[PDB]
């Protein structure tokens, strides 16, 4: 065997998966599993996908030391735990869960992607050890302040949509940012992003932006190709598209319209 895809079944318990030792990828997407167990024997497994299930806790993956990707999207997981042995983990997908705090991931120094969207996290913390982190998704959470990103120096994609962020800050050491998404917040002013020179796409729709002089912060991004500013108070200006066009000459797309 090499890849078992038991997608879309009525599985409620994990069993009779012991004879297969050479399995590298197990896919249990969209089932009714309630507990992770009987998986310790798949030691050379590189990809585990138990997304869209009824999991409430993370367990039974203590022995999968060779895991590279872990998909646990859409479950009932309340706390992040029992992942400390997965040193080779590069991608961690925990979207659409019930997590309230970022914890117990400091041992995953080889993480390149971290997805925690549609959860209940209230504070950005405990990310200081993921210096290899390239993508971080914290959208549709309870975030109120941007912080804890001072050690994500290779961060190139940051998604903070649908939160309660009021001020743009904490992005001092994230100079490699190419995609910054802070749309659907309570931001009133664009600040502290003038050092983000490699920005390509920048979503800031559904905020409270008022002054046109904030676009001076984006002048350093010569590769800025796409910018979203709709549903801001800036759109009340009848030359909203042209004003963005003139201030940001490098962009080829404003909202859903090309230039």
Cα separation, 217 vs 191, in Å, equals: 7
Residue 244, exposed/middle/buried by CB under 10 A (0-12, 13-18, 19+)?
Answer: buried
Cα separation, 74 vs 53, in Å, equals: 7
> In what helix (H) or strand (E) does residue 21 lie, and over which residues does it extend?
none
165 by DSSP, 3-state: which?
Answer: coil
213 by DSSP, 3-state: which?
Answer: helix
**Cα 86 to chain center, whole Å?**
19
Residue 101, exposed/middle/buried by CB under 10 A (0-12, 13-18, 19+)?
Answer: middle
Cα separation, 45 vs 42, in Å, equals: 6
Say if strands 179-181 and 201-203 run parallel, antiparallel, or are unpaired.
parallel
Q: Which of 51, 99, 92, 103 is nearest to 75 (CA)?
A: 51
Residue 5, exposed/middle/buried by CB under 10 A (0-12, 13-18, 19+)?
Answer: exposed
Cα separation, 92 vs 59, in Å, equals: 15
Using alpha carbons only, give the angle 81, 102, 108 rounded to the nearest 5 degrees. Answer: 60
Specify the experimental method. X-ray
> In what helix (H) or strand (E) does residue 257 lie, and over which residues does it extend?
strand 257-258
Using alpha carbons only, give the angle 220, 226, 227 rounded to the nearest 5 degrees. Answer: 80
Cα separation, 134 vs 46, in Å, equals: 20
Q: Note the resolution in Å, 1 decimal.
A: 2.9
Cα separation, 184 vs 231, in Å, equals: 9
């Amino acid at each position: 065997v090499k890849t078992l895809c038991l997608r879309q079944n009525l599985i409620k318990c994990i069993e009779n998966l012991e004879e297969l030792q050479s399995l590298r990828e197990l896919d249990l997407y969209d089932n009714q599993i309630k507990k992770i167990e009987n998986l310790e024997a798949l030691t050379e497994l590189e990809i585990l996908d138990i997304s869209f299930n009824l999991l409430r806790n993370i367990e039974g993956v203590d022995k999968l030391t060779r895991l590279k990707k872990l998909f646990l999207v859409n479950n009932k997981i309340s706390k992040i735990e029992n992942l400390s042995n997965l040193h080779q983990l590069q991608m961690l997908e925990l979207g659409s869960n019930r997590i309230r705090a970022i914890e117990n991931i400091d041992t995953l120094t080889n993480l390149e992607s971290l997805f925690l969207g549609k959860n209940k996290i209230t504070k950005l913390q405990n990310l200081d050890a993921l210096t290899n982190l390239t993508v971080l998704s914290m959208q549709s959470n309870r975030l109120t302040k941007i912080e804890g990103l001072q050690n994500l120096v290779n961060l190139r994609e940051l998604y903070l949509s649908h939160n309660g962020i009021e001020v743009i800050e904490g992005l001092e050491n994230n100079n490699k940012l190419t995609m910054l998404d802070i749309a659907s917040n309570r931001i009133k002013k664009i600040e502290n992003i003038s050092h983000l020179t490699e920005l390509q796409e920048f979503w800031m729709n559904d905020n409270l932006l008022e002054s046109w002089s904030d676009l001076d912060e984006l002048k350093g991004a010569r590769s800025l190709e796409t910018v979203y500013l709709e549903r801001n108070p800036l759109q009340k200006d009848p030359q909203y598209r042209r004003k963005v066009m003139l201030a940001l000459p490098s962009v080829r797309q404003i909202d859903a319209t090309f230039v």
